[PDB]
Amino acid sequence: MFEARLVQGSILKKVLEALKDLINEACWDISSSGVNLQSMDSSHVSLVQLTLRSEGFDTYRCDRNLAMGVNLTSMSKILKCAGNEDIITLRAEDNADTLALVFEAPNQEKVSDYEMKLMDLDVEQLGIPEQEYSCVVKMPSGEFARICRDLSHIGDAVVISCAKDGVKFSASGELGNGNIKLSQTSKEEEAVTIEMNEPVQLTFALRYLNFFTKATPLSSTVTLSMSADVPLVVEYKIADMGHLKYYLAPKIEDEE
Amino acid sequence: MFEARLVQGSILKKVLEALKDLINEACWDISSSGVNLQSMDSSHVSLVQLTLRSEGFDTYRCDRNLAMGVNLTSMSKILKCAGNEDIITLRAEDNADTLALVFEAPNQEKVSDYEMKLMDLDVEQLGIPEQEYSCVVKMPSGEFARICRDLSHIGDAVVISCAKDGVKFSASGELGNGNIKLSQTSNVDKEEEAVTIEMNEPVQLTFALRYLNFFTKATPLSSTVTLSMSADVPLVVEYKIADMGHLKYYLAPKIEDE
Amino acid sequence: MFEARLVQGSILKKVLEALKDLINEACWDISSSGVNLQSMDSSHVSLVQLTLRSEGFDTYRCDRNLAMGVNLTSMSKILKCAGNEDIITLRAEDNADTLALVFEAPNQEKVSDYEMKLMDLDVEQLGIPEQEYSCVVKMPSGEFARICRDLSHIGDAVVISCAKDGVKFSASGELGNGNIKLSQTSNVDKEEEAVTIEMNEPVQLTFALRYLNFFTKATPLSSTVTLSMSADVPLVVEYKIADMGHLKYYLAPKI
Amino acid sequence: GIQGLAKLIADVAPSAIRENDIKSYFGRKVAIDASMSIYQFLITTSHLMGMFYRTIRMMENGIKPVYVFDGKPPQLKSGELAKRSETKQHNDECKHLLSLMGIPYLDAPSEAEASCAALVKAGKVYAAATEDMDCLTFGSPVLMRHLTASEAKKLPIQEFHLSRILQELGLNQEQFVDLCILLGSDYCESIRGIGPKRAVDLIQKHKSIEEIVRRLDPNKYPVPENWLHKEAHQLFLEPEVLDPESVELKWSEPNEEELIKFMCGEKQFSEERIRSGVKRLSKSRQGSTQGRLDDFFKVTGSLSSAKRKEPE
Amino acid sequence: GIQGLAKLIADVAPSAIRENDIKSYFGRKVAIDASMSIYQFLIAVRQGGDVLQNEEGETTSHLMGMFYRTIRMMENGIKPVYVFDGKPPQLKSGELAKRSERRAEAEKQLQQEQEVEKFTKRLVKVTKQHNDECKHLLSLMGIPYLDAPSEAEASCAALVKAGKVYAAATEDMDCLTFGSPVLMRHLTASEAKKLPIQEFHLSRILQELGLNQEQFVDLCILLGSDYCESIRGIGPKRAVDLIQKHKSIEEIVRRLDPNKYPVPENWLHKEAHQLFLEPEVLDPESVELKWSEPNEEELIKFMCGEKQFSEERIRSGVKRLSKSRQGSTQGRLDDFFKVTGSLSSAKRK
Amino acid sequence: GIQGLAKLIADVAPSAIRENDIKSYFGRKVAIDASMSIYQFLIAVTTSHLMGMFYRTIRMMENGIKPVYVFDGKPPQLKSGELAKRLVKVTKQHNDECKHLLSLMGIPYLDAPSEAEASCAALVKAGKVYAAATEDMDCLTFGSPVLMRHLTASEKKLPIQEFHLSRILQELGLNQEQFVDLCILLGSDYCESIRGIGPKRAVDLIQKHKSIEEIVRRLDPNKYPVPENWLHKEAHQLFLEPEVLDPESVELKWSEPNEEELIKFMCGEKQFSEERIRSGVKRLSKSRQGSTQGRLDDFFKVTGSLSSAKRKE
Ligand SMILES: [Mg+2]
Ligand SMILES: [Mg+2]
Ligand SMILES: [Mg+2]
Ligand SMILES: [Mg+2]
């Protein structure tokens, strides 16, 4: 049984619009510690990890851990029924049959409530190990989101390169190829920062990245962590409540 | 003969947009009174009651009554050529076979005029007796729009539950159910152009959201809609047009038979 | 060797948008004097005349005259990758196999550079000798754009009838007919939103709206478009570009 | 049914006949003549295929059907004609595909058509749907034709209002009965004399054939052999029909499996379809609570656009 | 015509030869060789197997030809201008005076296979007065016809140059020897033969061979015209380099020639080279061509009437003739601004 | 190696060490000090230099560890007068046999100039390889950002241990330079250390007076004698600017093993059980087929499956 009251309703809205297109169903991990959600995409080539700490909710109460099987698209619709300013509250009984989403409106007049039917679902879980990537880029959520979009027009694979003072996403295709160099800032609004140990040049499928970018409204800044021949970690920090990470396996390069 | 000059042309534009989508064609009953129009949807579970008092037109003139058969859609298309701020002017000959429309931009630098083909058409009428209702909810027309839409994603049937306290729209479907509840903010005067209810007895009728979502197409016509209800009787969603008329939609209940 | 640095890339973004759909590919006639481009559509019915004078580039260096075969559409995509406020730079070397476009965003740290594949192409040309016109009309680029867009919803061809007092556009079709008369903006004398009409003798010609609503795609380039016509001769729809050039469209009358 | 009747009406009281669209019948409960219906489909899985599809279309538009069967036939003209000289297999195979779709059915004490009328004139159903005008003779207020036509044949349904017929022809039901008889009843031989339009007039100033005969009498207009102009006039009045109130029809929910396991299987036919079919039938059930505006507002009439001049 | 011409151009440089389709010729005027056509029509419906009678029967080709063909044209947006020949130049040989070459009249006497008895097409030079027979159909059809001064081939090729039309419609290639900037063949073809039309861009020729209108005429006369004579040992391509060098039927007979290739007696290469340059062509101006509308009945009668024809189709023919004049036809920019060449992308390397 | 650097780091700086299962290294490219590897291989409990590299490589393969073997080049000048006078081995020119096997297995191998781990570390630094593999820790002091130990030394089966250079410096408060002196101070392969100094003291002494020279001056009471002719300045230089490969001129590529050839070489020339090689070879060509697309399945262990709680109607 858990009940959470988030006055920043919209966060939830953003958090779902940021998950649905990439994964259809999933299991929410509610406990006294907070709310989490980790699932791979149907193709197992990508994986998202949500984390909402309980200290982040205006009110949070749990007396018995749960796991609600949810058809994210359905929850996506029900949240589209809450104004960006409403105070959202989630409440789920023990052997929960449904999840209750309540929307209180600012202008004390309207109050909506829904009961989303839950499902029997079994999501496979992974153990992501803490590791030190040999290149970490922190940049504007907006920019990274544009880079992936434009680049998806030239070709379908992006080649991120990273040195000590700049990073470069380039992609080739039918009409040609294109490069986009970001140079390290060095005060200002949102600057690009590279904390590189070893240089890197990876390849990733833009299709997948363009999904990750749906999470852009959750944070002004976005940070990419990368290494040799393993996954790329795209992270959006969610205010002072937690964060959201997407991991994307790389496209295998010439080693044949 | 027939010639109406309406300064607020947007009214026609807006009207024909509300209508074209719920009924494909209909008869405009022209008279010395004004312009009126009635027709039901092919299922006959609802109907539109358009009324434009000749008192509202800048200039009116109908010596002999007319009943124009009009393919609504075509009007919609021709009126989309009218400037939201132009002076639409209808005109029709005695045994007319076409309708003259004249859009006048106030800036006097532009004037259009289209001649639209008319058609033959018979339209089953219905007599809606003047009657007082148990519940009458005046509320933001755009609010009522969002409600009908949103619940239309949960279920396809809504339960309106009016009371002295407030209205409660509810729907239920495959993914579950939801209930929006508006209250009478007797909170003096602060906030939005909230909801107000006049009511003799609490009512609770069910309706086909599929239809209400057609009615709401008339939203740009009034910043507030008013739902009049009475037990086991059809719903009335009314959009007041300026002070020259109104647009009423009628909808048959859900006979919760047993 | 050719290099053009234009502070207001938008012009370019727009210019292509105006072409992309009327002509799939054309030859860019570069030179020490600027960038030009002529071409007809497949049907040999319409024609486009792009003229960007070098005086209109913050940096324009070219020695020898060059000619580039380009897939307007393809080039339109590489251009959509630039921001309405980026500083674009076109760059191409001799016997260029590709055109280089460098997008400098105002966010100083961003620098995009795409290499576009050029193509081999031969585009038929035309001689359009300067000719005075019976009637000419300077009217809002938007008003014209709407009239064409609208009448097109009535018929597939419009009949322009210009006269001293003013011009009248008219269609007819499956669902009735329509006419749109534009009085000359005398009283409402307000520079831009003005409708002026110079006339010799009254004209009246026909044109296919389909080809016209292709020219209108050039509307975001100028707050005003001008129609120049005379009997038996093709119609010219002119969109002046900033103070660096213009873009002209010619349409073959109907009879 | 009755001969040349439709034309007679069409030709002398068109106000009693309307050409409406199948959709306008949403919410209406109709009495059908299974017999004739089942027959229509034939003219061998058709006796049920059409009994399938059609009933789905009738449902899809909001129309709630009640198929009716005949019992022990009465003294019909050509009926007992071969007797002057002296099965239900594919029939009941339908009385099954129905309850398996949640569709009512009733065993008429004799002639369904009469029973159908019996219902209609009891508020138990809206109109009767047959192809034979008989229903009108039997006193039915509303008769709907073509409601069982193929989805293809884009024919609209044809409605008939008895109370409008009686209106124009200025004659009571009974007076109307005699007309049908002299028009060409399928119960007894008509009279070689009178013509379609002619037969009307006589009845108009002679409220009975009994009075029409004694008048015109020459060997120029002889009255039939064994003319039961009486026995018949009776049937059309007081037939043999199951009481209306006797039962309450209730449209049930279709049983996908049990049925599809007794159709595409036991009678072999494209599965993909009869599946999406049972699916659609199950959907139409949704609005089986949605009332009509008729249910609350009296029908005013009809506004007809002004007759357009010519290419002026 | 000019033998080899088609092949040479076909081989040497196919660039000037497009394979367009009728549909794409809308709103385009054309000057058709009234003669070259009627002739064409007759020498077609000649199955060398059909039963032959002594006296020639009543032919219906010329009419059935002009009809259904000038229909498809108009129905495609093409505005034809038929042009009948006039008074042949006093240059018999090469074609005329060749009644001796028209000595198949005897060949066709044998009869005794069904592929050689068909060499009766020589006897089908019978242009006779199918003209006064077709001009009647044309007037009833609306189309405008013209009686050129002499060989219609040049008159038509003149009108094109005079911008008074888009191009010449004739199978005879000698139309490019008059300057006609564009010549399209296979037009008067058969809606049924469904033979894609071909366009010859005269300039694109001279811009592949090099020469100009003057030289070209040398190469054509040297290739074999029908106005005068030609060389003996040299032919098609076997005499193109000889024109690209010495370019002049005079500076040619004096360089690189063991004389074992002698010039015909009183050879009129000079007086002919002049003709294929200043032909007796009518005035383009007084040519106020004017497509009208069908005389309807006047045509059903004359057709199915004086000369029996399925009235159920002649009507249906004139029916689809009017529905082809409805509305208005689109002009082509080409026909307004003179082409000035093509701009071509720099060698992509 | 570097006498005691192991435990020292274990203590003073634990955030630098981390033990991890092979599996976790999927997809990771690693440079292995073949020589050191080969000798270590020899000491088992001949044909061990082969038996070893053959299997130890397969296991690596099976987990998805693309490796490159690096072979020592010309030994840089140093005195290793380790007299002879148990299992005393001396890996000499077996290399060729090994280089041969690898070639057959399709595993790449580089020939470095001087020291192998020197070069190895060079690759790690460039980002041409995830880490360097050796039991000899002087790879770190040679600058290697990362070094995992026990990836071949399997001979029991201890867990691969990964040292992170950066953390070693942070924890200790030293800089590569300083660090190298610390190492030399501990017990280098290139020059005697300062007798008597304890690894701990060694650390202090370095963080106090940043360098070895600086330590000699500002210490020295006889109690801390210096080695005979010390070559610490000589050593320290080797650790800093060593002769290595050009990480850029590296062309790492893995080929498919050639079963035939292998059985010929192992089960033919170097008499080995055909049962064993055939089967091993099988495992190899299986992993070999590297998922042309990484599924996060390979990179991360499956912890389990979260099951939506039972519902109560
Ligand atoms: Mg019967
Ligand atoms: Mg019966
Ligand atoms: Mg060493
Ligand atoms: Mg070593």
Side-chain angles (χ1 to χ4, degrees), chain C residues 81-92:
Chain C
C81 287
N84 254 305
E85 301 183 24
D86 294 36
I87 305 176
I88 313 173
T89 313
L90 302 175
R91 212 195 302 292

Side-chain angles (χ1 to χ4, degrees), chain A residues 44 96 120-121 123 131 256, chain F residues 28 254 296-297 306 308 311:
Chain A
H44 287 211
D120 301 316
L121 185 86
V123 196
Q131 58 165 317
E256 176 62 55
Chain F
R28 302 286 203 200
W254 295 246
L296 281 79
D297 293 291
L306 182 62
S308 108
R311 279 195 310 305

Side-chain angles (χ1 to χ4, degrees), chain D residues 1-2 33 36 76 111 113 130 132 134 138 186-187:
Chain D
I2 285 54
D33 183 288
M36 169 179 260
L76 301 173
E111 300 194 64
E113 297 178 52
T130 320
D132 287 7
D134 290 334
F138 283 114
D186 51 302
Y187 293 56

